[PDB]
Motif scaffolding. Structure first.
Motif, PDB file in Angstrom:
ATOM      1  N   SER A 160       6.924  39.637  69.939  1.00 25.62           N
ATOM      2  CA  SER A 160       7.230  40.740  70.902  1.00 25.62           C
ATOM      3  C   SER A 160       6.113  40.826  72.045  1.00 25.62           C
ATOM      4  CB  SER A 160       6.989  42.040  69.968  1.00 25.62           C
ATOM      5  OG  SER A 160       6.484  43.017  70.859  1.00 25.62           O
ATOM      6  N   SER A 161       6.480  41.128  73.203  1.00 25.91           N
ATOM      7  CA  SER A 161       5.612  41.180  74.420  1.00 25.91           C
ATOM      8  C   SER A 161       4.882  42.466  74.645  1.00 25.91           C
ATOM      9  CB  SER A 161       6.513  40.952  75.499  1.00 25.91           C
ATOM     10  OG  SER A 161       7.450  42.161  75.984  1.00 25.91           O
ATOM     11  N   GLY A 162       5.788  43.578  74.322  1.00 26.50           N
ATOM     12  CA  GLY A 162       5.180  44.836  74.560  1.00 26.50           C
ATOM     13  C   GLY A 162       5.388  45.326  75.785  1.00 26.50           C
ATOM     14  N   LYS A 163       5.988  44.582  76.582  1.00 31.64           N
ATOM     15  CA  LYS A 163       6.179  45.031  78.026  1.00 31.64           C
ATOM     16  C   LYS A 163       7.030  46.191  78.065  1.00 31.64           C
ATOM     17  N   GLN A 164       8.112  46.463  77.417  1.00 34.61           N
ATOM     18  CA  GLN A 164       8.895  47.829  77.313  1.00 34.61           C
ATOM     19  C   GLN A 164       8.189  48.828  77.090  1.00 34.61           C
ATOM     20  OE1 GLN A 164      12.319  47.396  79.117  1.00 34.61           O
ATOM     21  NE2 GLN A 164      11.487  49.503  79.398  1.00 34.61           N
ATOM     22  N   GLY A 165       7.400  48.868  76.251  1.00 26.95           N
ATOM     23  CA  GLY A 165       6.436  50.020  75.571  1.00 26.95           C
ATOM     24  C   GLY A 165       5.354  50.408  76.643  1.00 26.95           C
ATOM     25  N   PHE A 198      12.630  52.470  68.550  1.00 27.42           N
ATOM     26  CA  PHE A 198      13.227  51.444  69.236  1.00 27.42           C
ATOM     27  C   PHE A 198      13.791  50.585  68.257  1.00 27.42           C
ATOM     28  CE2 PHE A 198      11.916  50.713  73.528  1.00 27.42           C
ATOM     29  CZ  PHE A 198      11.283  52.168  73.812  1.00 27.42           C
ATOM     30  N   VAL A 254      16.227  53.938  71.012  1.00 26.84           N
ATOM     31  CA  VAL A 254      16.362  53.144  71.958  1.00 26.84           C
ATOM     32  C   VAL A 254      16.663  51.760  71.614  1.00 26.84           C
ATOM     33  CG1 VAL A 254      15.421  51.973  74.467  1.00 26.84           C
ATOM     34  CG2 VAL A 254      14.716  54.362  73.430  1.00 26.84           C
ATOM     35  N   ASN A 305      18.011  47.467  71.951  1.00 26.98           N
ATOM     36  CA  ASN A 305      18.025  46.356  72.609  1.00 26.98           C
ATOM     37  C   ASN A 305      19.260  45.698  71.922  1.00 26.98           C
ATOM     38  OD1 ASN A 305      17.671  44.355  74.600  1.00 26.98           O
ATOM     39  ND2 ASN A 305      16.288  43.505  73.198  1.00 26.98           N
ATOM     40  N   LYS A 318      12.346  46.078  83.779  1.00 25.18           N
ATOM     41  CA  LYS A 318      11.554  46.747  82.679  1.00 25.18           C
ATOM     42  C   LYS A 318      11.249  48.276  83.280  1.00 25.18           C
ATOM     43  CE  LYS A 318      11.312  43.824  79.634  1.00 25.18           C
ATOM     44  NZ  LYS A 318      12.677  44.172  78.521  1.00 25.18           N
ATOM     45  N   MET A 321      14.535  50.291  83.431  1.00 23.22           N
ATOM     46  CA  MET A 321      14.870  50.944  81.952  1.00 23.22           C
ATOM     47  C   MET A 321      13.994  51.737  81.597  1.00 23.22           C
ATOM     48  SD  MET A 321      16.436  47.509  80.706  1.00 23.22           S
ATOM     49  CE  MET A 321      15.063  46.483  80.880  1.00 23.22           C
TER      50      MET A 321
HETATM   51  O1  W5E Z   1       8.282  46.467  74.397  1.00 23.78           O
HETATM   52  C1  W5E Z   1       8.998  45.399  74.266  1.00 23.78           C
HETATM   53  O2  W5E Z   1       9.581  44.799  75.102  1.00 23.78           O
HETATM   54  C2  W5E Z   1       8.882  44.746  72.889  1.00 23.78           C
HETATM   55  O3  W5E Z   1       8.148  44.223  72.435  1.00 23.78           O
HETATM   56  C3  W5E Z   1      10.026  45.436  72.122  1.00 23.78           C
HETATM   57  C4  W5E Z   1       9.776  45.255  70.346  1.00 23.78           C
HETATM   58  N1  W5E Z   1      10.918  45.731  69.932  1.00 23.78           N
HETATM   59  C5  W5E Z   1      11.167  45.819  68.451  1.00 23.78           C
HETATM   60  C6  W5E Z   1      11.145  47.050  67.708  1.00 23.78           C
HETATM   61  C7  W5E Z   1      11.343  46.943  66.370  1.00 23.78           C
HETATM   62  C8  W5E Z   1      11.779  45.699  65.676  1.00 23.78           C
HETATM   63  O4  W5E Z   1      11.982  45.417  64.426  1.00 23.78           O
HETATM   64  C9  W5E Z   1      11.702  44.476  66.650  1.00 23.78           C
HETATM   65  O5  W5E Z   1      11.877  43.134  66.071  1.00 23.78           O
HETATM   66  C10 W5E Z   1      11.367  44.609  68.043  1.00 23.78           C
HETATM   67  C11 W5E Z   1      11.776  46.240  70.990  1.00 23.78           C
HETATM   68  C12 W5E Z   1      12.814  46.954  70.763  1.00 23.78           C
HETATM   69  C13 W5E Z   1      13.916  47.027  71.811  1.00 23.78           C
HETATM   70  C14 W5E Z   1      13.179  46.886  73.186  1.00 23.78           C
HETATM   71  C15 W5E Z   1      14.109  47.281  74.205  1.00 23.78           C
HETATM   72  C16 W5E Z   1      14.459  48.364  74.659  1.00 23.78           C
HETATM   73  C17 W5E Z   1      15.135  48.736  75.667  1.00 23.78           C
HETATM   74  C18 W5E Z   1      15.525  47.638  76.602  1.00 23.78           C
HETATM   75  C19 W5E Z   1      14.857  46.301  76.393  1.00 23.78           C
HETATM   76  O6  W5E Z   1      15.176  45.464  77.193  1.00 23.78           O
HETATM   77  C20 W5E Z   1      14.385  46.119  75.339  1.00 23.78           C
HETATM   78  C21 W5E Z   1      12.018  46.434  73.190  1.00 23.78           C
HETATM   79  C22 W5E Z   1      11.348  45.887  71.863  1.00 23.78           C
END
Ligand code: W5E
Ligand code: CTP
Ligand code: CTP
Ligand code: CA
Ligand code: CA
Lengths: 212, 229
Positions: free
Chosen positions: A30-35, A142, A170, A172, A194, A197
């Protein structure tokens, strides 16, 4: 352009790392970019933002955002618990590890036995229902979902929303995704940058606070 | 001067990630920065440098360096097999995972309801040792210096130098870089267990300083070995 003034917002972002020993661990991609983007936009619209961050892609701290850095799922949990009492919005964007090694080696090193970590999102959801978070107005989860042999992507996403009980999920779809509300509303989340959204996500949060 | 002119250098850097499934993995905390620093310095001093990089996505590619990207320890192994015939010096600065999960799931492992199973591990090949064996069997006639890196502590069964000498003798590489560690930042303790151990018995201290200064001392150590031959 400043509707979230006066809102205390607590955001988790990045992936957690479950130590095997001082150097090795279990992690995710996970990049964390969307958070971070939700954190940046929240702050841009007037929120007092605290960002609990695990492992990220080299991300720079958003300006005007209180940074709290964590390693494991359990440290995330304690961080969420510590910053919980005054918050009005919880945005659970982190990929929190479901499992951790039961034993952490004291020195540099068989099989790794696992034990479950607490579900922080569900802990927040339950605490609010039992009266322990009266200030909490929006709990956002998420999910990264996909269709498989046991159902299509959106079936899995709805079931996840129903099971978590949060106000907003939210989703994905692993190109477009979804915003699932706890009142049954479902909006498509079109694929864009990012930031844009994140604007749609924060717009939905602001819309939920006004309805309540 | 430009002492590494004409030298072909193959450098590994960063840590590997051993997949549990598409999303999860076993990883380590290596930044890869000390490995990049050695490559950049080699390149700055005239080497033709090829850089095999692990988990270093936010790092900047050193200028003048051919980049090769890998994920797991096994992909690192295959990259080293492919690019070793072109190198004169092998600089194994990567933090290679010692073990890999035995089974890789095709999908994300769901959190169910029964007891979570265990992660079965299987050892990864020793890539540095594979290179040492290949050179001994005649498959690497161009290979002039094999360089390994190690983080060594002092435990109940010996100090840093005991364990490090045992590691050099065991790995069979020409030079073992020990505890090239830290960014020399405020409040970071210096334990002075930095060493450059050659296979001829020489032991020189590696002072803890910036990534660039330790990279310069390491390449200095390499150049001195190439001159001995
Ligand atoms: O912040 C980030 O990008 C990031 O790292 C994320 C980590 N999870 C995550 C959560 C629970 C998990 O079990 C799992 O495997 C991963 C995400 C889930 C959804 C989104 C998302 C939401 C809307 C638009 C979109 O493009 C991306 C981003 C992430
Ligand atoms: N131990 C956990 C795991 C999940 N999360 C949060 O819960 C939400 C749902 O994540 P997801 O991994 O999709 O839920 P799971 O129940 O773990 O779904 P699955 O078992 O299919 O992976 C995310 O907002 C995540 O940050 C959490 O707070 N605590
Ligand atoms: N499977 C491995 C193990 C390590 N290395 C390389 O060999 C050197 C030794 O690293 P180290 O982990 O200290 O050696 P190990 O034999 O794995 O010793 P230990 O079990 O104590 O960690 C490093 O240059 C590393 O890049 C490698 O090629 N492949
Ligand atoms: Ca999960
Ligand atoms: Ca090792």
């Amino acid at each position: 352009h400043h509707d979230m003034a006066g809102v205390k917002a607590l955001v988790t972002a990045g992936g957690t790392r479950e130590p095997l020993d001082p150097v090795r661990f279990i992690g995710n991609r996970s990049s964390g970019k969307q958070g971070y983007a939700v954190a940046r936009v929240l702050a841009q619209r007037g929120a007092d933002v605290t960002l609990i961050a695990g492992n990220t892609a080299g991300l720079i701290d958003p300006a005007g955002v209180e940074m709290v850095h964590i390693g494991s799922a359990t440290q995330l949990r304690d961080a969420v618990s510590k910053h919980a009492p005054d918050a009005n919005v919880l945005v659970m964007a982190a990929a929190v590890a479901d499992f951790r090694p039961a034993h952490v080696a004291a020195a540099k090193i068989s099989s790794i036995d696992l034990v479950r970590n607490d579900d922080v999102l569900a802990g927040a959801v339950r605490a609010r229902a039992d009266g322990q978070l009266p200030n909490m107005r929006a709990i956002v989860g998420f999910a990264a979902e996909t269709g498989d042999a046991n159902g299509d992507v959106l079936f899995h996403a709805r079931a996840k929303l129903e099971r978590k009980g949060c106000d907003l999920l939210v989703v994905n779809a692993v190109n477009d995704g979804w915003l699932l509300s706890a009142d049954g509303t479902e909006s498509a989340l079109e694929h864009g940058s990012k930031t844009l959204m994140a604007t749609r996500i924060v717009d939905s949060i602001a819309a939920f606070l006004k309805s309540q």
